[PDB]
Amino acid sequence: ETLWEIAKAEVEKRGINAEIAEKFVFFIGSKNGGKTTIILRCLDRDEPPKPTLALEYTYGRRAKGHNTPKDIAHFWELGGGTSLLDLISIPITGDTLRTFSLVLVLDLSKPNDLWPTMENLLQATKSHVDKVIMKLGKTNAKAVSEMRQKIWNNMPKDHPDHELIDPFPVPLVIIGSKYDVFQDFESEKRKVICKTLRFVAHYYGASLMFTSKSEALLLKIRGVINQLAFGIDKSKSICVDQNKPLFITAGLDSFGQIGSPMELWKKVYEKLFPPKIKDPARDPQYAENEVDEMRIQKDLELEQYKRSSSKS
Amino acid sequence: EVEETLKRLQSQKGVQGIIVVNTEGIPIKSTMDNPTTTQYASLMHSFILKARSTVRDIDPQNDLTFLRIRSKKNEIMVAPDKDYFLIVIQNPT
Amino acid sequence: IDTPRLCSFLRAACQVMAVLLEEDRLAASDSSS
């Protein structure tokens, strides 16, 4: 009697705070943007990138040195303006929102042609994460209030919190890809690109860093968001001056200095680059028994799948 | 093909309903209401079995070739099967 | 039921019904045209 009641009382008392729910990060990008290589490097692997992308799943483990806690970091990704919410809604659940972070990768090749891709994916994530905080019917939402106040008091750490330029309730880091093309851009094009790259970071309060092979900052900064996988914050100064490397600590990039909105984007868009069938009929085809059976199969299988009454 | 023929048959003023009973009283296709669909499939399943037994009892080397049962309300026809048969109901009037 | 190997029965059943219906259709001193 009292033996199990107390045992129950202890597992009830405990349960607030192997490791506690591990974090995971999702990679917004395009298809064949080089982002697969970036992810695989975050896993500290040398494997050739996979062509396809359909919520690819991979993870790894880290230790601390006093022990091996087996800190697992999960990785999810999607590329291109394909099945936006149908797939974005899959790896993201409200129960783990506080443990969820985004990183957005942009191919420098054609920022304009890539902009609707990342924008659509980003909107899908933004809308989704905003809802799941209470869509689950989380009555005891105190945690929801706490975690939101954390996110919107991490970047305006010291600077007076004048306004939340865009309430964005999930961590975000932004980075380009294949900067090898940037050195070959026209001076005028590099400048207008810099305006938007600088702006978008401070707009979301998302840090920036470069991407290369010898560049350890990529692994380091990614590691921080990935459960300190490659160290700690190690906040450095903004590199808006050199423009050769890339690095921005969110909070030091005040608009008045880095930009010096709608008009900014419109201007950069116009200057940088403005030029931004299934045949179900099967008419040139014929068959008699093959098409008759296919019609039969279609009906019978479709009705069977409905009858399964799956809750999924 | 078969679906088009069934529709054409159903369009005939004589036909009052068609049931495709597959797994021994379990239908998949019907042009009738659910209570009648289930009852009719069951009844004709039992009924045809009785006729087949009757024929074998008359002669131990012959099976059913066709079975028809008539009533004042409607008339029902079934055919022998290996795996499943089909049910047709018509108004003889 | 998914297999045409069984749908053959469905065809045959339709053929019987069609003929029976056709048979059922065979129902009934000066100018009356």
Swiss-Prot record, chain A:
Coiled coil: none annotated. Keywords: Cell projection, Ciliopathy, Cilium, Cilium biogenesis/degradation, Cytoplasm, Cytoskeleton, Developmental protein, Disease variant, Dynein, Golgi apparatus, Microtubule, Motor protein. One of its GO terms (cellular component) is ciliary basal body. Pfam families: DLIC (PF05783). GO terms for biological process: determination of left/right symmetry; intraciliary retrograde transport; intraciliary transport involved in cilium assembly; regulation of cilium assembly. GO terms for molecular function: dynein heavy chain binding. It is found in: Golgi apparatus; Cytoplasm; Cell projection, Cilium; Cytoplasm, Cytoskeleton, Cilium basal body. Its main location: Golgi. The keyword Transmembrane does not apply. Expressed in bone, brain, kidney, and cartilage. Lower expression in heart, liver, lung, placenta and thymus. Light intermediate chain of the cytoplasmic dynein complex 2, a multisubunit complex composed at least of eleven different proteins. The cytoplasmic dynein 2 complex consists of two catalytic heavy chains (HCs) and a number of non-catalytic subunits presented by intermediate chains (ICs), light intermediate chains (LICs) and light chains (LCs). Belongs to the dynein light intermediate chain family. Acts as one of several non-catalytic accessory components of the cytoplasmic dynein 2 complex (dynein-2 complex), a motor protein complex that drives the movement of cargos along microtubules within cilia and flagella in concert with the intraflagellar transport (IFT) system, facilitating the assembly of these organelles. Involved in the regulation of ciliary length. This is Cytoplasmic dynein 2 light intermediate chain 1. It comes from Homo sapiens.
Swiss-Prot record, chain B:
Keywords: Acetylation, Cytoplasm, Cytoskeleton, Dynein, Microtubule, Motor protein, Transport. High expression in heart, liver, brain and pancreas; moderate in placenta, skeletal muscle and kidney; low in lung, prostate, testis, small intestine and colon. Isoform 1 expression is up-regulated in 64% hepatocellular carcinoma (HCC) patients. GO terms for biological process: microtubule-based movement; visual behavior. The keyword Transport applies. One of its GO terms (cellular component) is membrane. Its main location: cytoplasm. It is found in: Cytoplasm, Cytoskeleton. Pfam families: Robl_LC7. One of its GO terms (molecular function) is identical protein binding. It comes from the Eukaryota. Homodimer. The cytoplasmic dynein 1 complex consists of two catalytic heavy chains (HCs) and a number of non-catalytic subunits presented by intermediate chains (ICs), light intermediate chains (LICs) and light chains (LCs); the composition seems to vary in respect to the IC, LIC and LC composition. The heavy chain homodimer serves as a scaffold for the probable homodimeric assembly of the respective non-catalytic subunits. The ICs and LICs bind directly to the HC dimer and the LCs assemble on the IC dimer. Interacts with DYNLRB2. Interacts with DYNC1I1 and DYNC1I2. Acts as one of several non-catalytic accessory components of the cytoplasmic dynein 1 complex that are thought to be involved in linking dynein to cargos and to adapter proteins that regulate dynein function. Cytoplasmic dynein 1 acts as a motor for the intracellular retrograde motility of vesicles and organelles along microtubules. Belongs to the GAMAD family. This is Dynein light chain roadblock-type 1.
From Swiss-Prot, chain C:
Signal peptide: none annotated. It is found in: Cell projection, Cilium; Cytoplasm, Cytoskeleton, Microtubule organizing center, Centrosome. Disulfide bonds: none annotated. Expressed in chondrocytes (at protein level). It is linked to Short-rib thoracic dysplasia 8 with or without polydactyly: A form of short-rib thoracic dysplasia, a group of autosomal recessive ciliopathies that are characterized by a constricted thoracic cage, short ribs, shortened tubular bones, and a 'trident' appearance of the acetabular roof. Polydactyly is variably present. Non-skeletal involvement can include cleft lip/palate as well as anomalies of major organs such as the brain, eye, heart, kidneys, liver, pancreas, intestines, and genitalia. Acts as one of several non-catalytic accessory components of the cytoplasmic dynein 2 complex (dynein-2 complex), a motor protein complex that drives the movement of cargos along microtubules within cilia and flagella in concert with the intraflagellar transport (IFT) system. DYNC2I1 plays a major role in retrograde ciliary protein trafficking in cilia and flagella. Also requires to maintain a functional transition zone. Intermediate chain of the cytoplasmic dynein complex 2, a multisubunit complex, composed at least of eleven different proteins. The cytoplasmic dynein 2 complex consists of two catalytic heavy chains (HCs) and a number of non-catalytic subunits presented by intermediate chains (ICs), light intermediate chains (LICs) and light chains (LCs). This is Cytoplasmic dynein 2 intermediate chain 1. It comes from Homo sapiens. The lineage of its organism: Eukaryota, Metazoa, Chordata, Craniata, Vertebrata. The gene is DYNC2I1. The chain holds residues 583 to 630 of 1066 of the full protein.
